[PDB]
C-alpha cells in the first residue's frame, strides 16, 4: 500500500536476498511506518477500550449454581456471505442446554 492505502502500481520486484532499489525500499518504508504508527495508536485505543470494558463489567461474578431459566439463545453454524465461517460445534461446546434438543425429523 501507498499513502491513502491504495496499492502501488509497481510492486517490490526484488527481495531481501538481492539489492532493493532506492524507490523500492522507500515504498516499503511507507508500509513499515504505517504499521508502526498503527500499532502505537491501536495500543493506546485498546488500552482505553479494555479499561472501559473492565469498568462496565467489574461487578459481574457468578454467584448461583442454578436459576431454572428455560429461556436461552439459539446457536447455528454461522454462514455469512455464502459459506460457513464457524461450525456449530465450537459455539455450542462449553455451553449448557436451555431445552432438550431433538433429532431433525
Amino acid at each position: 500500500a501507498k499513502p491513502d492505502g491504495s496499492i502501488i502500481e509497481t510492486p517490490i520486484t526484488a527481495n531481501f536476498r538481492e539489492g532493493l532499489n532506492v524507490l523500492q525500499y522507500f515504498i516499503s518504508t511507507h508500509g513499515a511506518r504505517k504499521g508502526l504508527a498503527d500499532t502505537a495508536l491501536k495500543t493506546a485505543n485498546s488500552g482505553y477500550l479494555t479499561r472501559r470494558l473492565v469498568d462496565v463489567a467489574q461487578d459481574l461474578v457468578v454467584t448461583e449454581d442454578d436459576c431454572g431459566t428455560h429461556e436461552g439463545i439459539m446457536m447455528t453454524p454461522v454462514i455469512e456471505g455464502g459459506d460457513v465461517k464457524e461450525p456449530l460445534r465450537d459455539r455450542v461446546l462449553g455451553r449448557v442446554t436451555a431445552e432438550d434438543v431433538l433429532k431433525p425429523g
Binding site: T10, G19, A37
Partner: protein, 1340 residues
Amino acid sequence: YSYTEKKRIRKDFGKRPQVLDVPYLLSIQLDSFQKFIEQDPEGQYGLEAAFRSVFPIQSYSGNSELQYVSYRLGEPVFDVQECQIRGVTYSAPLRVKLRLVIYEREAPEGTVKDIKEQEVYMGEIPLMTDNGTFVINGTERVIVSQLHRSPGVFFDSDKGKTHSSGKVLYNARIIPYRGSWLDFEFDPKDNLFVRIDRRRKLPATIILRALNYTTEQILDLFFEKVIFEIRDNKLQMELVPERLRGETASFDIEANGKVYVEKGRRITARHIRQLEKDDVKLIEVPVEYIAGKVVAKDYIDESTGELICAANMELSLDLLAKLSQSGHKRIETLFTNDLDHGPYISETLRVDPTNDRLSALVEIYRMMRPGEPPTREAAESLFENLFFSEDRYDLSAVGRMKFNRSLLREEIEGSGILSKDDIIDVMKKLIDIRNGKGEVDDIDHLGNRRIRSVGEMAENQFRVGLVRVERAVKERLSLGDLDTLMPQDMINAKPISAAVKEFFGSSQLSQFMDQNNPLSEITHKRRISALGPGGLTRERAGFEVRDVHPTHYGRVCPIETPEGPNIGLINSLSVYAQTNEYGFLETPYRKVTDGVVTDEIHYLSAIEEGNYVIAQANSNLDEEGHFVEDLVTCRSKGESSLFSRDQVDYMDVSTQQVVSVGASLIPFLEHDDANRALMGANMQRQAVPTLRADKPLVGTGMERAVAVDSGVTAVAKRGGVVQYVDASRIVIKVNEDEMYPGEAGIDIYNLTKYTRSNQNTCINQMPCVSLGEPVERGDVLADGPSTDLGELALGQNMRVAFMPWNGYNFEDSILVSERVVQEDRFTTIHIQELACVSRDTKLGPEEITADIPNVGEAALSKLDESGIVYIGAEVTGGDILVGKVTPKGETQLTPEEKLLRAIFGEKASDVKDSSLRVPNGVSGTVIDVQVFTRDGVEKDKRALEIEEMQLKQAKKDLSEELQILEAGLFSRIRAVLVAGGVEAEKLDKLPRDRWLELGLTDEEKQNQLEQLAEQYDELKHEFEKKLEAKRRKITQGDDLAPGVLKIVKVYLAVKRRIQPGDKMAGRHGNKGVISKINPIEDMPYDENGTPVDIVLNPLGVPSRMNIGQILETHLGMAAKGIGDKINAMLKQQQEVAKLREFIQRAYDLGADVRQKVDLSTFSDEEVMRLAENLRKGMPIATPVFDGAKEAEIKELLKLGDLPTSGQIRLYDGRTGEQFERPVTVGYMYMLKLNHLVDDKMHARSTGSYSLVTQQPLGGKAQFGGQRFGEMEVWALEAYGAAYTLQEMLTVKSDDVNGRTKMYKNIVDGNHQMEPGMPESFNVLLKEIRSLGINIELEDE
C-alpha cells in the same frame, strides 16, 4: 588524499563515484545561527530585522524617539571549554548604539536635541559553538529544528460533516508569522463563515462590512454580472456561451431566431459548442427566468430616485414592472450555478445580520471580547491592529512569498500585513476551490511545511522581549522627563535576557544533547521535530501526519524515527538535505542536460521537486553521463515509474541521500525490512562507547564523515609536523606557509579526557598520531569516543555463529563467549556527576569541610582537609564525597534521643550533616572534581589547587609559545651579532639570554641589537599580560543562582562489564539480551579450533526480515580472513613486496569498483603501517543501496581460503561433536546499547514512603516498589486472585499500620495479615470532604 586515510584504507564496494561529496553534516545549526547573529546591510533574518521591526520607539507625547543605529556582538568573556568546566553559559554580550532625539515642541518636524548612548548593555545572548550546540548551564544543549505550517494561504478540506447529507466541505486558513489566524470555512448550507483565531463563527461579509464595503461592492467583487435588457416581450438576455457548462436548461435557449435548447433539458457540451459557433449575442427568454435571478445592485427610480430594487434580494414580476415603468434598460443580475460559482456570498449576505460598518465592528468587538460594552472607536482600533498594524500582524518574507504563491501571484514579496485585496483574493480562490477549479493543498507536503531552525526561534522570542522592553520604554518616556536622559537609564536587562534565557534553557525544543556517540550527537542536531510551539502536539493521531509522504523523500529519513508514541513527528534530516533561504527543505539533484547527468547540483525544494522528474541513483552511468537503461526508474510526484533516459530532468546526487546519518551507517540496508532497519538505526544512537574503539569490518563509508563532522574529533586546525604527542595534549609545529604575519608558533590541542558527556557516559579523545608525523589541516589528530583512526566505532566486530545452541538463545537472546569478557570488550566507562551545593540559609551559610558531625573516621579517611575526596579514591555507595554541613537552627533533643545517645555514645552538634553521600547502588573512582566559587566567597585549598593546575596548563601552553618566539628572537640576534665582527664563540660559552648584556661597535648592527632587545622586552610583557588575563579568567568568580555559595561537582567512573541480561544489539535491528556467560570451552569451535565469540538465534532472521546481518556475517568472515591471512604473513616477517601484492589484490577485488590502487603510498613504511592496521581484519565500506553483491562476498571468502558458501562445519565445543550440516560463521558488528541490565534492575522490601501517602517512592538510594497498576489488578481479578489483591493493595502498599504489623509478623516467623484501611482512600475521602461534599461510613 588524507594522511590519516593512508594509515588505514577501508575497502569500498561502491560502484558509482560520489559525484557530490558529503557536506558538513551540522551545516543547519551553524548556518542558522550565523544568519541570526551576523551583521546585516538590509532588513533580513537576524537581530537587525527584529530591531528594525520594533524600533524606533515613539512616546505618547513629547516627540522623544529612541532610534537604533548599529549593534555589535561583544567578545565573550569565556571560551567554550572554560564555559563548560565552569558551569556557566557561553554567551556573547550584545551592545547597541542608541540615540534619544527630542524634536521641536511644538512646531513643524525638527529636532531640538540628540543624545548618544553608545554600546548600551541590554543583555548577553548565548552563542553557538563551532560544533553547533549551546552551553547554557555548563551543559551542551541543542535547539532542535522545528517543522511547522509555513505562513500563508492553506486550502484544506473539512471532512466528516455529513449530517445525513454527506459532502466534504472546504476551508481556507490564513497563517501569519505573528498575529491572529484567519478562517474562511464552509457549512452544509454553502454559507461562508469567518473565524478570527478560533473565535466563534461570523458571516463572511461582516469583515467586508468592517472593511467599508457595501452590499453592491461585495456582490460586484466576487460574482459575475449577467445582462438583462428591457426590450421585446418578457425581456432578453445577452447570452454567454461559457455560462451553461453547469446550468440546466430552464428556458428556451434560441440561436439564429430558433430555439436550440428546449426547457427542462440538461445543457451539454454540444449545446455550448453550437452556441459558440452560432455567435449569438442576445436571446429572448421568459420573464419567469428573469424573476429567478437576483439583482447585483440597488435600482431606484429616474424621476424621484425612490428605491424599488435592492441588492441581495431576488427579482419578481412586480419589481420588473416597477423598473420598466420607472425607466430602465440595463439590469445587472448575479450569476448563480450549483457546480461553478454559486450564490455562496449572496446567501451569506442574506444571513448576515449587519449591513453597515459600525454594527459589524461592534459585533466583531463583542465576539472578540465577551462583555466589554463596545464603542465604535475601540472596535475600529482593534480591527485595524489585528489586521493592518505592523506591530501585531506580520507575515514576514516567507509568509508573504507563500501567500502570493498560494494565490498564484508573480510577486515574491509584499507588505507583512493583510490587505483588502489579499482577503478578496482568498475569497475568490476559495469559491473557485468549491467550484472545482481549485485543488486542496496537502497538509504534510514538505513544500507546505517549513523549518524553523535555531535562528528563527531565537529572533522570534527576542522580538517578544523587544516588545516587552518597548512597552516599558514607552511608559517611562511619557511618565518621566522629556528632556535629556541617557537611553541606558530606562532599558532593563531583565526582560530581554530573561526571555532569551527562557528560550535557550526551558523551551520544548531546547533539548539536552543526546551525547553517547558521535552518531547520537549528529542525529540530535539534525533532528526535525514537528512538535513544539506553533506546530503539532504529541497527542495528535495524527494518522495523516505520522505517515511518511511521497515528498518526505530525500529530505528527512523515512527509516529514522522513534518507535514510541511520536513516530512520524520526530524525523531526522537526510544526509544531503539542507534548509532553504525561507526555511523549506531542499535536496541536491544532479542536473541532466539532455542525456548526460552532469556533476553540477541544484538544491531542489519540495515544491520544485514535483514539477520535474527525478531519476534514481541506481541504473549506473556509463560513458560520460548516460544511463545504462533506456527505461530508468524515476519518481515524478512520489510514485515509482519508468521513464525514458531522454525524458528525465534531475537525478539523485548519491544513493545515500534518502536516509539519515544513522540509517546510512547500516550495511546491506537493502537486505533488511524497513521496520527492522528502522529499529536498528534507532538502537545505533543508543550504543554506549566501548572501552576501546575498534573499526567495523563491514561499514558504509559514512563512519569517517560522521567522526570528522562531529565535535568529538580533535581535528588539526592548521597543518604541520606534530611537535609533541601526549595523552592529554597535542602540540603541532605549524608549517611556515600557514603562519600568520609575525609569529604564532605552535598550535595546541588540549584533549577532552574522561568527561561525562550528557548521559553519564565517558567521552575521551584518543591521540592517534606520533612524534614527527606530518599532518595537514582537516585530519584526525586524536580519535574521539566510539571512533578509531577517524572512523566511527559505534560497537565492536565479533565472531558469530548462527545456530540455536541449546535454547539459551531462544527468541533473539544472545550467547556470549567467556573470551568476550576476557578481552574486556563490550566494557564501558560510565561517569556519573553528583553536585553538592553549599548554600547560604537564613539559619547560616552551609560549608564544605571534612568535619562532619558524628561520623566514622573510615569515610573521612578518603577526605582531604579541604573536605573533598581525593581524585583517584575508590568509593562505594553510602560514603561521603563532599562534606557539606548546615548550621542547625536550634539544638533540641527528644528524651528518646537522649536515651539513644546515652547508650550508643552519640555526640551533640550545633550543625547538621547535609553532606553529599554516594548513591546507594553505585560505586567507582573519583576522576574529576569541579569547584564553583563566585566572587565575594573565600577560596579554599581544593579551589586553589584546581586553579593551580589550570594555571599551570595555561602557563605551559603560553610558555611553549614563548620558547618558540624567543628561540627565533635569539637566533636572529645571534646572527646579527656574528656580523660586524665574529663573536660566535662567546655566545656558545654563555647562556643564550645573556647575549643581551654584550655590546657591539656602533653600527646598524648595534641599532638592530637595541630594537631586538626592546622586542624581547615587549614579548616578555606580552607573555606576562596574557598569563595575567588567563589568571583573571580562571580566578574570577563564576555565575551562581542567588543564595548558593559554592557548587562542587564530583565525577564517578564505573567500569560496567557486559553480563547476562544487558541489551546488546546489532546494526540491522537484530536485538537481544545476554543469556549467560558460558566458559570459552563450552562455546563451539571450528576445524582450526577457534572458538566462536557470539551465538545468535537463527530463528530471528526468517521472521524479523533482517538478512543483511547474515550478509554482514559472511562479508565479515571474508574480511577477518583477509585480516587473518595477512596476520600469518606478519608472523613470518615476510618481505614487504609480498604484503604489497596481497593488499593490492585484496583492494582490487570487485567489478567497476572505485578505490584506486597502490603503489601510491610509500614503498615500505606506509605499507607496514597499513598491514599492521589491517592485521585485525580489513574494513569494508558498503554503501546502503550500492553495496557488495553476493558474488563479491563469495570472491572475498575465496581469497580468504574459507568456505565460499559461507558455512564452515563447527564442532559443538560443549560436547565436542560436529552437527549434521555446517553452520553460518563469520564476523558481525555488535553494538552494546545503553540499556544495561545493571541500570535496569531494581527491587525493594522496605524503605522510603511519601509524606502525602504511604505509597513507596523516593530517590535512587532505595527506589520505591514497582507500579502495580489497575491493569494488573484486573489481571488478578480474572483469576480467583482475591486475597493477593488485598495484600498487594492494602498491607504491602498503603496501610502503614498494616505495613508495620505485617513486617513484625514476617520477622516473628509467620505469614499472617491485618486487614487494614488503606490511606489512599482516606486521602480521597478527606479531599472529597474538602469541597463541602460529605463522605461518611455506614458503620457495621
